[PDB]
Design a protein around this nucleic acid. Structure first.
Ligand SMILES: [Cl-]
Ligand SMILES: [Cl-]
Ligand SMILES: [K+]
Ligand SMILES: [Mg+2]
Ligand SMILES: [Mg+2]
Ligand SMILES: [Mg+2]
Ligand SMILES: [Mg+2]
Ligand SMILES: [Mg+2]
Ligand SMILES: [Mg+2]
Ligand SMILES: [Mg+2]
Ligand SMILES: [Mg+2]
Ligand SMILES: [Mg+2]
Ligand SMILES: [Mg+2]
Ligand code: NA
Ligand code: NA
Ligand code: NA
Ligand code: NA
Ligand code: NA
Ligand code: NA
Ligand code: NA
Ligand code: NA
Ligand code: NA
Ligand code: NA
Lengths: 119, 194, 65, 49, 81
RNA sequence: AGCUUUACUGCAGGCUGUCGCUGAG
RNA sequence: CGCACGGAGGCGAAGAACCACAGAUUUCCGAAUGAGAAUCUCUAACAAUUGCUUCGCGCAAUGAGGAACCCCGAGAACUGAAACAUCUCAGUAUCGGGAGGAACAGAAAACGCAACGUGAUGUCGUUAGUAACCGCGAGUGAACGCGAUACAGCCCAAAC
């Protein structure tokens, strides 16, 4: 909430989540804030996911500002445990990253835009 | 590359700046309405917790503890005292608020033992510290190498004997040389002069 | 004396319970006599009735009844 | 005063402890034992409680 | 475990109740109720218990005055033991 | 030792300035 | 067949008594734990606080004791200063909390015989009534090093 500066329309969210599962089978993804973080740092990040229900918030506060100075596009997920399930994990995940999608690029490509457009 | 953690940490260098500032201005509110000892499922400072011995495992608990701010709550003398000993206002306790917190917490969880603790802020009248505790009886811990040590009998009630880290520090045991003549190997063995 | 361990063990879980209740009743009447200024006693016996009972019980424990 | 079943038992024990040292013990001990070093008179003494 | 009946309370007064009211007096265990005392007796002696009065004695023991049914005879019972 | 006071020295308590809680124009 | 040497009686060659280890039994109150209560009572019980959790007291923990010793907190006054306030008595007496068979300490952000040197920690001897403190009064008072004792070094957090 303190690091959330724009709300992602329920449906737009679905699209992002869909692209993730497909990217988890066509290409590569990063589960867990630590790995996500290093991606944004090692540039190897296309699109990153951040949950809206995380406590403590410290764990994620840095994602936005960090991404916003590395070009890497990022979108918000409302529930932490859907992101986990999407990434392919039993448990939930605070934030994940899509490293080289796969058959999800067009979608992602547009999501990246769709969001930029959502400011 | 910088671990994700390193950010959580760097953010607390100045708990009164940016996001962490507003975050505190918000939490403390829900905090000032919580109890004395509140078990919480996740550490507000993951870097620190993990650093001090935390581990998202079983038998590992955390709890936030508030303690009043200020000097000792002392009662004036009701019998003869020489001037030196008639003080009240400026007398302070020899055990830091952090240690006070580690104890209030440990007592709330009789079966557990204190592993460590760290600060998490303070408003105008109180201080909050989060305390990491351990179920010395859980097999998940009895089998973890980086922790099973705390199961030893001689580790029982360690916080009340000052074996905690904040304890050994508050005991003047930091330095190994000059200055620690009356602290090591023990305050009491040095006739309480440190 | 007028009862042994082996002999107590050569009984069946139903024979001891049987022997037990026997002694008790004997004991109880012994006491009844004493209570009424009993004289035709043989003190070394009312003492035994207690030890025997102990033994039968000790055994009911060991033998699993 | 109304007593309880517990109190009544204690008193009973006390009354009993307040008896002579059996005549025979004297002989059995060649008279080294004669006095009940615990005689408690109702008037002259005071029972706890 | 503890036994309900300790033994026959035998004294002049107990005799009277026996020879006059068909009553048998017993020294029983203090945790025993009247009903328990009743049963126990009808068993160890094979009779019919009509009524039972109890009293906690200054001896640390509980005395019970048991009255038998008109059929059974107190004297005849007590005689055998 | 109790007691007193414009005895000596201090300690509670009260009033007051300041700092922290403490932010917007 | 206790101390305990009486009387009556009994037990033991089916090896008793007696001693060693192991086991059985082991009332009520008692941390006292279903609830209450001057050791009893009333209608199934880990009361209470916790951990894990089949989220069910299901599996566990705590509580209390102990000669002193130990560790962490609270902390006098008589007294000495020939009065007395700092100082001293003394971090003593006493109080609160807690561990063990021993505790605590412990592998250098050390020492600083200043070195081309020592090498975790307790303790004992000495260093020394030295340095240092103090109405610079009365008093208070180490350490490094040295000789001994015994020696023992390791584990995470993070980077990947
Ligand atoms: Cl502890
Ligand atoms: Cl050296
Ligand atoms: K003084
Ligand atoms: Mg390892
Ligand atoms: Mg020591
Ligand atoms: Mg009498
Ligand atoms: Mg009555
Ligand atoms: Mg005077
Ligand atoms: Mg009770
Ligand atoms: Mg003087
Ligand atoms: Mg002088
Ligand atoms: Mg001194
Ligand atoms: Mg030195
Ligand atoms: Na505890
Ligand atoms: Na000091
Ligand atoms: Na009297
Ligand atoms: Na009797
Ligand atoms: Na006076
Ligand atoms: Na025993
Ligand atoms: Na349960
Ligand atoms: Na003097
Ligand atoms: Na004087
Ligand atoms: Na001075």
């Amino acid at each position: 909430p303190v690091y959330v500066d724009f709300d992602v329309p329920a449906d737009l969210e679905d699209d992002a989540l869909e692209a993730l599962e497909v990217a988890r089978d066509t290409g590569a993804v990063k589960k867990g804030t630590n790995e996500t973080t290093k991606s944004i740092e090692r540039g190897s990040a296309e699109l990153v996911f951040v949950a809206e229900d995380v406590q403590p918030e410290e764990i994620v506060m840095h994602i936005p500002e960090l991404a916003d100075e590395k070009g890497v596009p990022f979108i918000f997920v409302e529930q932490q445990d859907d992101l986990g399930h999407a990434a392919g994990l039993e448990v939930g995940s605070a934030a994940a990253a899509v490293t080289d999608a796969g058959e999800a690029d067009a979608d992602v490509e547009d999501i990246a835009d769709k969001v930029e457009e959502l400011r | 590359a910088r671990s994700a953690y390193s950010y959580i940490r760097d953010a607390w260098e100045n708990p009164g700046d940016g996001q962490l500032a507003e975050l505190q201005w918000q939490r403390q509110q829900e905090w000032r309405n919580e109890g004395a000892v509140e078990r919480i499922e996740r550490p507000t400072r993951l870097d620190k917790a993990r650093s001090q011995g935390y581990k998202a495992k079983q038998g590992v608990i955390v709890a936030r503890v508030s303690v009043r701010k200020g000097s000792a709550r002392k009662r004036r003398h009701k019998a003869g005292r020489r001037s030196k000993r008639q003080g009240v206002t400026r007398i302070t306790r020899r055990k830091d608020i952090q240690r006070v917190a580690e104890e209030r917490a440990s007592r709330t969880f009789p079966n557990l033992r204190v592993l460590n603790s760290y600060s998490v802020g303070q408003d105008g009248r109180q201080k909050w510290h989060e305390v990491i505790l351990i179920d010395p009886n859980h097999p998940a811990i009895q089998n973890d190498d980086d922790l099973s040590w705390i199961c030893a009998d001689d580790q029982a009630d360690r916080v009340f004997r000052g074996l905690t880290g904040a304890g050994r520090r508050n005991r003047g045991l930091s330095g190994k040389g000059k200055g620690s003549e009356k602290t090591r190997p023990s305050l009491r063995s040095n006739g309480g002069k440190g | 004396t007028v009862l042994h361990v082996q002999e107590i063990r050569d009984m069946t879980p139903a024979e001891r319970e049987a022997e037990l209740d026997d002694l008790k009743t004997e004991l109880l009447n012994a006491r009844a006599v004493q209570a009424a200024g009993g004289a035709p006693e043989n003190p070394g016996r009312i003492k035994e009735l207690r030890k025997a009972i102990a033994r039968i019980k000790t055994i009911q424990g060991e033998e699993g009844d | 005063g109304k007593k309880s079943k517990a109190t009544k038992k204690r008193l009973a024990k006390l009354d009993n402890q307040n008896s002579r040292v059996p005549a025979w013990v004297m002989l059995k001990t060649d008279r080294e034992v004669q006095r009940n070093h615990k005689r408690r008179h109702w008037r002259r003494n005071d029972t706890d409680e | 475990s503890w036994d309900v009946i300790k033994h026959p309370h035998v004294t002049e007064k107990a005799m009277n109740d026996m020879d006059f009211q068909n009553k048998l007096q017993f020294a029983v265990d203090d945790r025993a109720s009247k009903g328990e005392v009743a049963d126990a007796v009808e068993e160890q002696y094979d009779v019919t218990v009509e009524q039972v009065n109890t009293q906690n004695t200054m001896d640390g023991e509980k005395k019970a005055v048991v009255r038998l049914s008109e059929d059974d005879d107190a004297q005849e019972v007590a005689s055998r033991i």
